[PDB]
């Protein structure tokens, strides 16, 4: 899977909100482009002159994420964040020249991402009460990953002492994205655990935080909620469910070729962090069948 790279695998089965620190600093921003940010402005102008209803939005930028020594007390992860925008993404990660920007950032800064917007996405491995994960089918008419399978998620918008409010907005955003797209009541959802961070190499290395969320409804009840919104209550064109039993071997299935990169990152991290038992009971052959 060359289109996805793991930046972070969390310990302990995944980290809760209370164990994560953020540092939000202009030192973590994109570097101005070599020949100036006028190249971003030009792309944006061209786009607005064809689609004048489009609007910019701020986004969080991922600079880096450092894990504490495993087994330690205190905060377990430090997220280094800056600010970016949808406009800066369209002018850098989405540009035809994005690979040239990656080479120049290696030359100039020793950092392939230094000239890239790299907005932080969020995604969920969302489990039902009857042990299925939730999948969504993408419209064949959108610009990004048309017609491919996704998981719930999105790209959160801004508004350890500004840090803790930023970590709160990241965790809140993955629940809000599940309520808005799957049409689930907020009180049917567990507090999220962070599983890790995955990069999309087809989008010049932009990263997504991947979370585990448990729902108290069965697959049948989740389907009813999604569908009862009607076609205008969701951006996706369909919902479907895979038993957690069968997610273990998903990369060997014909489904794997239809998964978008950020959904592949969610399923690899689910399998490594929530799957893959370490203990004698769950690791016994009748409960963890070989192969
Ligand atoms: C990544 C991180 O975020 C906040 C603190 C740390 C960290 O590394 N903590 C630590 C270092 C050394 N011994 C024990 C714990």
UniProtKB/Swiss-Prot annotation:
<feature type="domain" description="Nudix hydrolase">
    <location>
        <begin position="117"/>
        <end position="273"/>
    </location>
</feature>
<comment type="similarity">
    <text>Belongs to the Nudix hydrolase family.</text>
</comment>
<dbReference type="GO" id="GO:0046872">
    <property type="term" value="F:metal ion binding"/>
</dbReference>
<keyword id="KW-0479">Metal-binding</keyword>
<feature type="binding site">
    <location>
        <position position="262"/>
    </location>
    <ligand>
        <name>substrate</name>
    </ligand>
</feature>
<protein>
    <recommendedName>
        <fullName>Uridine diphosphate glucose pyrophosphatase NUDT22</fullName>
        <ecNumber>3.6.1.45</ecNumber>
    </recommendedName>
</protein>
<feature type="binding site">
    <location>
        <position position="138"/>
    </location>
    <ligand>
        <name>substrate</name>
    </ligand>
</feature>
<feature type="binding site">
    <location>
        <position position="55"/>
    </location>
    <ligand>
        <name>substrate</name>
    </ligand>
</feature>
<feature type="binding site">
    <location>
        <position position="150"/>
    </location>
    <ligand>
        <name>substrate</name>
    </ligand>
</feature>
<feature type="binding site">
    <location>
        <position position="181"/>
    </location>
    <ligand>
        <name>Mg(2+)</name>
    </ligand>
</feature>
<dbReference type="GO" id="GO:0008768">
    <property type="term" value="F:UDP-sugar diphosphatase activity"/>
</dbReference>
<dbReference type="GO" id="GO:0005654">
    <property type="term" value="C:nucleoplasm"/>
</dbReference>
<comment type="function">
    <text>Hydrolyzes UDP-glucose to glucose 1-phosphate and UMP and UDP-galactose to galactose 1-phosphate and UMP. Preferred substrate is UDP-glucose.</text>
</comment>
<feature type="binding site">
    <location>
        <position position="155"/>
    </location>
    <ligand>
        <name>substrate</name>
    </ligand>
</feature>
<feature type="region of interest" description="Disordered">
    <location>
        <begin position="147"/>
        <end position="159"/>
    </location>
</feature>
<dbReference type="InterPro" id="IPR055295">
    <property type="entry name" value="NUDT22/NUDT9-like"/>
</dbReference>
<dbReference type="InterPro" id="IPR000086">
    <property type="entry name" value="NUDIX_hydrolase_dom"/>
</dbReference>
<keyword id="KW-0460">Magnesium</keyword>
<feature type="binding site">
    <location>
        <position position="143"/>
    </location>
    <ligand>
        <name>substrate</name>
    </ligand>
</feature>
<feature type="binding site">
    <location>
        <position position="157"/>
    </location>
    <ligand>
        <name>substrate</name>
    </ligand>
</feature>
<dbReference type="GO" id="GO:0052751">
    <property type="term" value="F:GDP-mannose hydrolase activity"/>
</dbReference>
<feature type="binding site">
    <location>
        <position position="177"/>
    </location>
    <ligand>
        <name>Mg(2+)</name>
    </ligand>
</feature>
<feature type="short sequence motif" description="Nudix box">
    <location>
        <begin position="163"/>
        <end position="184"/>
    </location>
</feature>
<feature type="binding site">
    <location>
        <position position="86"/>
    </location>
    <ligand>
        <name>substrate</name>
    </ligand>
</feature>
<keyword id="KW-0378">Hydrolase</keyword>
